[PDB]
Amino acid sequence: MTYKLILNGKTHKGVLTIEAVDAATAEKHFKQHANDLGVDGEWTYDDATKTFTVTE
Ligand SMILES: [Mg+2]
Ligand SMILES: [Mg+2]
Numbered sequence: 001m002t003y004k005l006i007l008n009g010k011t012h013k014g015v016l017t018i019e020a021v022d023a024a025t026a027e028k029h030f031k032q033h034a035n036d037l038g039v040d041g042e043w044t045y046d047d048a049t050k051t052f053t054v055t056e
Contacts, residue, residue: 001019001020001021001022001050002017002018002019002050003017003018003020003023003026003030003050003051003052004016004017004049004050004051004052005017005018005026005030005033005051005052005053005054006051006052006053006054006055007034007037007039007054008041008053008054008055008056009037009038009039009041009054009055009056010056011038012037012038012039016030016033018030023045023047023050026050026052027045027052030052030054031043031054034054039054039056040056041054041055041056042054042055
């Protein structure tokens with residue numbers, strides 16, 4: 001199962017995908033990868049397109 005993340009951070013941008021089992025596990029990892037970068041932002045998840053956004 002492919003989940004995508006949009007990062008629109010103030011210094012870091014991009015699009016990352018991750019192969020996961022539920023969106024629970026994608027969330028965990030992408031949210032940890034956010035912290036690691038120093039991204040604190042507003043999060044969204046659209047289930048139909050499997051896409052997390054996080055915007056600083
Ligand atoms: Mg880690
Ligand atoms: Mg670190």
